[PDB]
Design an enzyme around this catalytic site. Sequence first.
Site, PDB file in Angstrom:
ATOM      1  N   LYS A 132       0.855  -1.186   0.000  1.00 47.66           N
ATOM      2  CA  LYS A 132       0.000   0.000   0.000  1.00 47.66           C
ATOM      3  C   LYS A 132       0.887   1.229   0.000  1.00 47.66           C
ATOM      4  O   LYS A 132       1.431   1.620   1.035  1.00 47.66           O
ATOM      5  CB  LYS A 132      -0.979   0.012   1.174  1.00 47.66           C
ATOM      6  CG  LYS A 132      -1.981   1.156   1.131  1.00 47.66           C
ATOM      7  CD  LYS A 132      -2.109   1.835   2.496  1.00 47.66           C
ATOM      8  CE  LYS A 132      -2.460   3.308   2.408  1.00 47.66           C
ATOM      9  NZ  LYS A 132      -1.368   4.162   1.864  1.00 47.66           N
ATOM     10  N   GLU A 188       9.722   0.682  10.958  1.00 47.50           N
ATOM     11  CA  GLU A 188      10.805   1.648  10.878  1.00 47.50           C
ATOM     12  C   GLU A 188      10.133   3.005  11.108  1.00 47.50           C
ATOM     13  O   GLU A 188       9.294   3.433  10.313  1.00 47.50           O
ATOM     14  CB  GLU A 188      11.482   1.570   9.507  1.00 47.50           C
ATOM     15  CG  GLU A 188      12.145   0.224   9.154  1.00 47.50           C
ATOM     16  CD  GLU A 188      13.626   0.171   9.529  1.00 47.50           C
ATOM     17  OE1 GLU A 188      14.158   1.235   9.934  1.00 47.50           O
ATOM     18  OE2 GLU A 188      14.270  -0.904   9.416  1.00 47.50           O
ATOM     19  N   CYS A 209      13.422  10.257   8.528  1.00 53.15           N
ATOM     20  CA  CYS A 209      13.293   9.588   9.820  1.00 53.15           C
ATOM     21  C   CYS A 209      14.523   9.798  10.689  1.00 53.15           C
ATOM     22  O   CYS A 209      14.439   9.934  11.918  1.00 53.15           O
ATOM     23  CB  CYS A 209      13.008   8.099   9.522  1.00 53.15           C
ATOM     24  SG  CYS A 209      14.296   7.193   8.689  1.00 53.15           S
ATOM     25  N   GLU A 230       9.747  14.999  16.995  1.00 57.53           N
ATOM     26  CA  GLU A 230      10.089  14.911  15.593  1.00 57.53           C
ATOM     27  C   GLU A 230       9.279  15.963  14.832  1.00 57.53           C
ATOM     28  O   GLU A 230       8.053  15.954  14.855  1.00 57.53           O
ATOM     29  CB  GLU A 230       9.762  13.531  15.078  1.00 57.53           C
ATOM     30  CG  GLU A 230       9.889  13.387  13.571  1.00 57.53           C
ATOM     31  CD  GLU A 230       9.941  11.939  13.155  1.00 57.53           C
ATOM     32  OE1 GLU A 230       8.874  11.287  13.141  1.00 57.53           O
ATOM     33  OE2 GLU A 230      11.052  11.452  12.878  1.00 57.53           O
TER      34      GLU A 230
HETATM   35  C1  LIG Z   1      18.180   7.796   1.485  1.00 53.27           C
HETATM   36  C2  LIG Z   1      18.025   8.693   2.695  1.00 53.27           C
HETATM   37  C3  LIG Z   1      16.959   8.442   3.701  1.00 53.27           C
HETATM   38  C4  LIG Z   1      15.966   7.321   3.562  1.00 53.27           C
HETATM   39  C5  LIG Z   1      16.420   5.969   4.028  1.00 53.27           C
HETATM   40  C6  LIG Z   1      16.680   5.740   5.375  1.00 53.27           C
HETATM   41  C7  LIG Z   1      17.078   4.467   5.766  1.00 53.27           C
HETATM   42  C8  LIG Z   1      17.208   3.433   4.833  1.00 53.27           C
HETATM   43  C9  LIG Z   1      16.936   3.667   3.491  1.00 53.27           C
HETATM   44  C10 LIG Z   1      16.538   4.936   3.094  1.00 53.27           C
HETATM   45  C11 LIG Z   1      16.842   9.356   4.882  1.00 53.27           C
HETATM   46  O1  LIG Z   1      15.961   9.209   5.748  1.00 53.27           O
HETATM   47  O2  LIG Z   1      17.691  10.399   5.012  1.00 53.27           O
HETATM   48  C12 LIG Z   1      18.691  10.680   4.131  1.00 53.27           C
HETATM   49  C13 LIG Z   1      19.502  11.775   4.372  1.00 53.27           C
HETATM   50  C14 LIG Z   1      20.537  12.093   3.505  1.00 53.27           C
HETATM   51  O3  LIG Z   1      21.277  13.214   3.794  1.00 53.27           O
HETATM   52  S1  LIG Z   1      22.506  13.271   4.709  1.00 53.27           S
HETATM   53  C15 LIG Z   1      21.849  12.901   6.181  1.00 53.27           C
HETATM   54  O4  LIG Z   1      23.499  12.319   4.204  1.00 53.27           O
HETATM   55  O5  LIG Z   1      23.084  14.595   4.606  1.00 53.27           O
HETATM   56  C16 LIG Z   1      20.771  11.338   2.336  1.00 53.27           C
HETATM   57  C17 LIG Z   1      19.974  10.218   2.048  1.00 53.27           C
HETATM   58  C18 LIG Z   1      18.932   9.850   2.913  1.00 53.27           C
END
Ligand SMILES: Cc1c(Cc2ccccc2)c(=O)oc2cc(OS(C)(=O)=O)ccc12
Lengths: 494, 494, 494, 494
Positions: free
Chosen positions: D186, D262, D296, D393
């Site tokens: 979904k 998550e 997150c 958050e």
């Molecule tokens: C891809 C990504 C995600 C999503 C994700 C989290 C866990 C597992 C898979 C995907 C995120 O939440 O923050 C990020 C923040 C970034 O910027 S930073 C913190 O390096 O400057 C660069 C890339 C992401």
Amino acid sequence: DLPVLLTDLKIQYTKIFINNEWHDSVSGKKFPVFNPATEEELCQVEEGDKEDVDKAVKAARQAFQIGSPWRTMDASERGRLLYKLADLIERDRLLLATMESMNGGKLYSNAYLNDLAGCIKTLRYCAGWADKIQGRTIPIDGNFFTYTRHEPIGVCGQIIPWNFPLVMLIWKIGPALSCGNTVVVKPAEQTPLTALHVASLIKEAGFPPGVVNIVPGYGPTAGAAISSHMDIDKVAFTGSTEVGKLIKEAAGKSNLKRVTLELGGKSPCIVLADADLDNAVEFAHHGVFYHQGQCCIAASRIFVEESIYDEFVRRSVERAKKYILGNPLTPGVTQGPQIDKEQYDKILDLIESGKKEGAKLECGGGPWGNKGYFVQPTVFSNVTDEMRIAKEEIFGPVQQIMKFKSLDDVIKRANNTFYGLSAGVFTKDIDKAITISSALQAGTVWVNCYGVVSAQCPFGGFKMSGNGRELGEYGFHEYTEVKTVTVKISQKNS
Amino acid sequence: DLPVLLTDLKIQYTKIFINNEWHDSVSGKKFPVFNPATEEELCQVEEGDKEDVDKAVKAARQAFQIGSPWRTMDASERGRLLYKLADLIERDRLLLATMESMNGGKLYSNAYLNDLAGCIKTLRYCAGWADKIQGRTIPIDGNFFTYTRHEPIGVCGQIIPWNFPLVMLIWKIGPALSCGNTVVVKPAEQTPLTALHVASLIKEAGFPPGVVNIVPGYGPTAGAAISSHMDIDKVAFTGSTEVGKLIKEAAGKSNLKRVTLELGGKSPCIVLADADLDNAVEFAHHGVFYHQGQCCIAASRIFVEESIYDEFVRRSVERAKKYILGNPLTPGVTQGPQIDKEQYDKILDLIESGKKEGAKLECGGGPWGNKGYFVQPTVFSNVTDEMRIAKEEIFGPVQQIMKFKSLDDVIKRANNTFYGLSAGVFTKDIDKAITISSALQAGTVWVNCYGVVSAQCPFGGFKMSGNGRELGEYGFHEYTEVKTVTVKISQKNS
Amino acid sequence: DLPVLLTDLKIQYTKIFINNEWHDSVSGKKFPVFNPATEEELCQVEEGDKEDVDKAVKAARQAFQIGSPWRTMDASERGRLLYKLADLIERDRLLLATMESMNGGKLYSNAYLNDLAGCIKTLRYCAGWADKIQGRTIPIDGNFFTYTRHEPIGVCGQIIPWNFPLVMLIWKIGPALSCGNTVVVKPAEQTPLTALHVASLIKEAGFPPGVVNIVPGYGPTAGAAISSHMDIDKVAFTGSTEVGKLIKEAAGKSNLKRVTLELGGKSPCIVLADADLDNAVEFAHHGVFYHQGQCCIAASRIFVEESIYDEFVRRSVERAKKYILGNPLTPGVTQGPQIDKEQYDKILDLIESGKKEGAKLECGGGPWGNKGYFVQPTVFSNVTDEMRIAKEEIFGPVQQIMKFKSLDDVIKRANNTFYGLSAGVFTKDIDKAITISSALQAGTVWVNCYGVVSAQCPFGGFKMSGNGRELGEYGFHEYTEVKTVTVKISQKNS
Amino acid sequence: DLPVLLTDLKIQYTKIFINNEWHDSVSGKKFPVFNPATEEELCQVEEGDKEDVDKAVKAARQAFQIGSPWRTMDASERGRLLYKLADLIERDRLLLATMESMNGGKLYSNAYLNDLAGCIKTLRYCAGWADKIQGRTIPIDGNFFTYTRHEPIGVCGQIIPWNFPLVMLIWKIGPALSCGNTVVVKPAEQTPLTALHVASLIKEAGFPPGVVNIVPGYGPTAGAAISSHMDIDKVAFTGSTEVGKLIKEAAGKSNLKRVTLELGGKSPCIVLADADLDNAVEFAHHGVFYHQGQCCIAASRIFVEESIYDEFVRRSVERAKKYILGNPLTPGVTQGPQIDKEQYDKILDLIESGKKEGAKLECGGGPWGNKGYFVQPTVFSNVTDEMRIAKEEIFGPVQQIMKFKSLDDVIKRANNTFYGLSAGVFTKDIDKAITISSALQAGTVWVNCYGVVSAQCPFGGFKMSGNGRELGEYGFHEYTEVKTVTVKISQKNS
Ligand SMILES: Cc1c(Cc2ccccc2)c(=O)oc2cc(OS(C)(=O)=O)ccc12
Ligand SMILES: Cc1c(Cc2ccccc2)c(=O)oc2cc(OS(C)(=O)=O)ccc12
Ligand SMILES: Cc1c(Cc2ccccc2)c(=O)oc2cc(OS(C)(=O)=O)ccc12
């Protein structure tokens, strides 16, 4: 707490151990065993040869047969026997440590607090792996059920060195037995006695006969007999690289028996300008001088960044000048003898090259006493890379200190040997620690320490320092033989 | 679907491959390459020697240096290059299969449907391991952080056999590369051509120069040069047990390079009275006759329970009499030639012993044709254990069938060889399948099938059939070198 | 050998255990503990509530703090404490088995030979995992060093059932402690006594205070207090599926604490026509009747192929008619009482449905004695799938036997429940064993046996029979929390 | 290289995806999909409800049945389909990135270079695990052969968030499919479009019908339908912690379906005085501002040692003042809008609390533009721990900077939240890096970096930030169900 034995040690066990019973040699010859600190004979021991190695292998083969007690018992029960052996060694700790000290020229404080502790702990670690050795189920292409068995290999010949007789005996038999192998052990000619006592304890613990067999004697006879034997499945050996090559070669010409080798080193430390100087001096010092330098991992080349080189040398020389040579058994004594004449000579000969080839002698550089194989603790500064003392494993109480100013260059120098057993890196900087340890061609790299070895950690060399790993999860692989079973089925499902 | 090539095959790649470029030999000598089915020369190929193996190792050493593109690229990118190579081989499937068939005397249907499929699939399997090779973090005693790196070993020398030139090249380079090693490959003197094409594709895929180097030539020159080389970290070899011993021996005398060997067999099947007879006959038949018997795992001793022995033999002989010998390229042809004269002679000589020592010849027993190295498919019944044909790997289209009535006894007979590559067990009974497969001293045991090999399953021999395993998760271990890093810390926490 | 206690058992330990000391309840209330075989009060025990669970969690939180003795001690020392606890339980085997038998209505022969053996063995297995729990080093994309720590989760609440009080206490605390967690245990209201003795032994063994805390009392008060607690990291529970849902639900509404559940079953056996009939009857019988049917894995639906159905029933009924009901402590007695009234009633009520809904009663079907919660061993044949006795876990000495003639159909019937804890398959045919065990939606499938459970094997349910696995290598995962550490570096190398 | 699409994007796929075909909703209702940057409707999409989730689960159940194409195909072929899907996504990279940018308010440069790259790479990683998922063979006590199967669980419901629609869809379906599960997905109500395109590509790649089913619609209807469904085996969800609790709770009350979550974070960075200041400022900045703070793992509390606090703030505020707000599709634009009104309001409301509760506003603090959900990038210094902005958050472009002078204290502050998704530690000192990362209660700890996430590394939260891990070797465990098979044998051998 350093407790001691209340009574004179009596040598009880001096025979060949096969099928949980004591054998005289097939020849009837015995051979003497000496105290390296007095040069006095301690006793005679039955002398094993090919003829006796043959009796031991037949016993081991029989105890390995499908349907035997050792093959059919629960893995957990293999573990139980191993933890029982550890409890028994613990019970006989005072006795064993004294015997180790008296036979191997090893400081009693070390023998009791370090060797025997590591010995008990390593056995208990190995006991715990026994029923946790597992194969796999595998999603093979096509309509088949495939699984693997990680079986014991079979009869393992195990040649033990004289520098750590009890610890190395347990480093070898612990994993071998935990995995379900049977063993034919040849303790060092110099140091057969503590192994023969352990054999008495293996009988007491109730291992089935023929699972462990111990054949004391000489290398070029009983050792060759092992390495060339046509019904020995694997050989494990710790010692010189030179003899290592003979063993590997002999395996190839005989029956392609599996081989693992733990050999010499010319292990380097790189001390960066930003290092905790006192911590680096202390670990590099103990790193090379421990057990009279008779360590495979001896920190035998210490590379210090130029701006702290002088101060490093000074502090190192001061620490080297603090030793009290004498009988390993007398409390307060802080340096025992070397193991024997062959070794004593090579060391003195290597110290001579140091002087001739123009290293700077800070202290030591000659023998000590009227008896015992004693060498003064020796420090050489301004050592260069083509010097003998910089290339050859000395296996003696001799430290080399050299300078560097280029990191790229010193890593090439550190790596420019056929050895590669271990290395040390001293710095406070995260990036340098990780990148230098990665670039060293060494099996174990210590950061801000040296000589930290434990059952949980696999151990072995890059290059001519060894083939394979011992201990940890990874070392356990080399005492198994993997069998794949693939069964045709009408239809598989994930 | 069996599609074919529309145009005459043209031999393009015939030079030594080093640093992604084509080299003439240092001598300038070339050597001929023949078609085993016509005995005609197909071309000449540059002849590699020690002098050229030296150039290849230097290239491999350089491509392995810390900071190189191959050392620094993401593991996932090593994987990507491998899956790219697989796509390229898939693109050139028709061409490669034809070349394999024409050069190696291999049935084209097999070459195209089996060899090339396994080749593509095995590469893709290995690509997937590249970024999933992992070390450990370890709860060492004392106040330390300990981790391990499963590094590539370094320069791996890889000697490939002539029976499955493409499949064995990929079985070797796939894992080696997936783990981050560099390789110096020596294809069989008989069958260098498909490897040289693959090298063209390795360049096309964009592997960094020096990561794969291919040196065609002879065994006792270029092969010895590899096995004895002082800067080669590991040697992998598939072939005869006899040559296996030479390699292991040479490693020991040179630089203690790591060794893995996949060698001959005299692999047995045990067929129980309760077995599905037709399924057992079919698998045991294909088990020994596949690729003209030129399989390490050839089911060369078939033990059938007495009450079904007669019927087993009859059905086996009928199936053997159905072959159509001729050019591997012509459709409908079901048996090609043996690879060369050396092999042809040994096989005929072994068939002669069969007759002399009084086995019962059911069919075959002589050569075929006016040209090509063809041997009639041969079946011997009433074979006994001291007969040459029961002891020696024939590596030819020759089946042995023997009877048994005692299960304990036949398992001893099955195990009574220095070989131990594989075995087969045919029964419907759960307990017998498990207990017999457990008791066989064989690296792969098939139940109710034979010859089922795949990338997911580790493969190798017990005893003189090999050291180590190839493929599966377990085989990947032998292309890594484990380094332990132990860091002093102020205080550890679980 | 069935030895026994020489003296009347004296109940010594009856208080709440927190920080290695004995606490009266915050209320001061106590609650009675009965013998199910006499219905007599054995003693009173301090009654724990939310207020006391709170004291226990604070103790557990403190003992889990970074820098504590439990967090900083070597993993090997966690293992040592666990093997010490096992030795202590072994020392008190007679006492503990008698207490288990007297409190839980459990046959003494079973209690002594089975429960206490499994208890000691499982502890020793877990001790061995402690310093073999490892994370990984990972070849992450980009210029980073990445490793993982498999940390303890933290404070684990552990609710123990009354059917196997000692075994389930050890199944829970063994892994939890081996991994470095701290625990707050709530033994069953019916059976708090053996856990309180174990706590005395945990103190004796020298675990740091607060690492194990035991809070006896009731489920809907102290159990709810655990499952809803805001500083409890994980809850483990064995019991009814119905209560399982309450726990999982409460975790979600409180603090998303991790959950593992081992719950009921309605576990089926499929007996094929080709099965060893006597072996199938024996295992299916003991499979459902063991410990008065008070087993989560009770073989409560036995599906037998039509052509052997009659003979299976007859032999099953004969075996059921051989029991001697009475005091679990008296030698020769072969069936004890059910645990309590709540349970007694549900069972009799379910036996009534069996009769009403027209199953064929072969034997049993009513209560026994003037005191104790005794139920005659009961066998029902011609059971159908919509019958209550075929759908509801009885948790009593009641066997269901039904026929089938279609294999596809009977597998659908076997799978047509919300339960899925375990199953049994009886056949001699290799293919059927593998394919049926694959198709069953059951966590543990036994072939040609039933009820074979051991520390080496992970255990838990599919579907509403549980979340997670206990024991084996795999079960150890659920007492760890994985932390990834990713460190920026200047340049990585493979 | 930032290439772009040449033609206006056309929305093609807008229906429910079940059994590889496009369904209108059972109601016939559709629902609008907006561009967050214009607030204009982009299209309408079929609206899924319980009635449609039911159709999707039945399809998934059927595709999971024993004997189906998805259950019987080789694992390697599951892998092949996954790498085929990755190639297809790569082919449609421009299209997908534009759709992602236009629908999710996501910068196109990021969408194309980061989201789509991670998406392709993660799929390829997962493809590689498919035929490397393995069970075990286990040396169980007693005379038994025991193995385990790591089976797919079954029908997995997967709720995807709006912040990273493509990446999170692949993070969920990649492992689920690699392990052999079937899925009912979904996508977020806000962002259903890219998932519907991926479904078109799943059909093109040739996955069997019913293996992937996609049901767009609302959370409290279709999401609840999933989390409460009686034939869904597992639910995976990424989103707010608040909704996480509802899901876990609903699983418990329905069918005890397995759960992984998550969830949110309030992730802290600790910047030590010895840190590389510029590197810390840059990573902490991007750490919190990436994708308009809609991460997150947002580095939402930055703790800087007092002596560098001022300079850290100044440099941070300068970097925050450099943004160009506007249409994610226009090149040069460096900040897009927030996703929608619900989110926009919460963020502005939280910024208001910041001002009221007396944090120091360095820049930002209000909305931007006449349309789109734009929030000025906002920096608050002198933030304290009880402030709303320090506890909740925000999920918006709002950074908090606070000072510390005590390391022990700041670690308590960092850990003093119910969240625990991630953390950052900036220092040059080896010991501090290791000991602080160990002491943080956070699932991923970055040292000298932030936000470094990859397929090779498992990822998930401590505490109320999540249950379970996704990706890496470890995350693959949560898409398997372990079955133990234990077979009675006449006699086992090691
Ligand atoms: C891809 C990504 C995600 C999503 C994700 C989290 C866990 C597992 C898979 C995907 C995120 O939440 O923050 C990020 C923040 C970034 O910027 S930073 C913190 O390096 O400057 C660069 C890339 C992401
Ligand atoms: C591929 C193959 C090989 C080569 C190989 C061995 C081990 C690992 C990789 C490759 C072989 O030796 O014999 C075979 C015999 C077959 O025929 S059978 C025995 O199934 O009827 C079918 C395929 C092979
Ligand atoms: C120990 C035991 C248990 C408890 C248990 C289950 C799982 C994991 C650990 C413990 C049980 O539920 O049933 C049993 C039934 C037996 O009888 S049988 C089925 O072999 O005839 C023998 C032993 C048990």
